[PDB]
Amino acid sequence: QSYERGPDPTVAFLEASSGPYSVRTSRVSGLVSGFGGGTIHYPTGTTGTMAAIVVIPGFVSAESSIDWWGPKLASHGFVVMTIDTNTGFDQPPSRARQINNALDYLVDQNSSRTSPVNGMIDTERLGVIGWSMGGGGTLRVASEGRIKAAIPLAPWDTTRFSGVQAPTLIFACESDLIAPVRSHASPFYNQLPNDIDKAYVEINNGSHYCANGGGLNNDVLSRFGVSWMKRFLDNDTRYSQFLCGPRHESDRKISEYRGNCPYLE
């Protein structure tokens, strides 16, 4: 309970466009960083330290990105850095390097005397969200033992994920032509070990962009994704009710759910 922030949650509260905090941003240029540049999002009117999240896009022919996740999560009491589209990285191994570089940068910002997020980050509580080959990257990083929560979005990779060590929620896109679920998200989920808390949420008729945020799927992304980071970065069991209990497949937007509820303490 020591890391819990904000009011007792409800479905309506999670599905609302914004969380309880106003949000500010700080731009990070590619010139001064090793991960491609991005935007740090953080809540105003908080005190103490909070978990930090890196959000990475990794689709080679992307026409837009994942920045919806930045304000969404920051408004719920996270420091959240969205990474810009970056052709300097590509395949999943390089995306894992990119993610680690970004996490390193965000950890370093906690002690940077010019950073607006100086002293706001609990450097021991880090999460990653990543799209496409960046979702492959997220699963790789989730195997390394530093991050405490992972959310791959429409992941693409060519390896296996039996060694993932962080609680992992995979968003799969049913009609994905870029990273077909039968070759990517679904086998990746099935490879995850039994000693982690995990979930698989396939979005009905989703294209490869289905979990990027900012379109018609925000309710499912909010309920699952905010709850995942609350539960597993903040140890906030007030959010367990949204992850474990509901008949998820009753939601018309969820074409398949898998998981290993309950997520015991």
Count of beta carbons in the 10 Å neighbourhood of residue 32: 9
CA–chain centroid gap for 220, Å, is: 13
Kindly name the residue from 84, 176, 234, 236 that is annotated as catalytic. 176
As a dihedral over the C-alpha atoms of residue 109, residue 126, residue 185, residue 215, rounded to 10 degrees, the angle is: -60
| CB-facing half-sphere around the CA of 46: CA atoms within 13 A | 27
Nearest-CA neighbor of 46 among 9, 106, 5? 5
What is the H or E stretch that residue 107 is in?
helix 92-109
For residues 155 and 165, give the distance between their C-alpha atoms in angstroms, rounded to a whole number.
17
Asked if residues 77 and 3 have their Cβ atoms less than 8 Å apart, the reply is: no
Q: Which one of 208, 234, 236, 248 is the catalytic residue?
A: 208
CB atoms within 10 A of CB 47: 7
User: Is the bond leading into 246 cis (omega within 30 degrees of zero)?
Assistant: no
The question of whether 176 is a catalytic residue gets the answer: yes
Q: Which residues of 197-216 are buried (b: 16+ CB within 10 A; e: fewer)?
A: bbbbbbbbebebbbbbbeee
Resolution (A): 1.6
Instruction: At 34, list the tokens.
Output: 């090793």
Method of determination is X-ray
Closest by Cα among 171, 195, 194, 198 to 184? 171
Nearest 10 degrees: CA dihedral of 265, 123, 165, 240? 30
Q: Which tokens hold the place of 2?
A: 């020591």
Which residue out of 65, 132, 143, 227 is catalytically annotated? Answer: 132
- Residue 21 Cα distances to 2, 78, 113, 171, 239, angstroms: 19, 10, 24, 26, 18
For residue 147, give the DSSP letter: -
Active site residue 76: no
Does the annotation count 26 as an active-site position? no
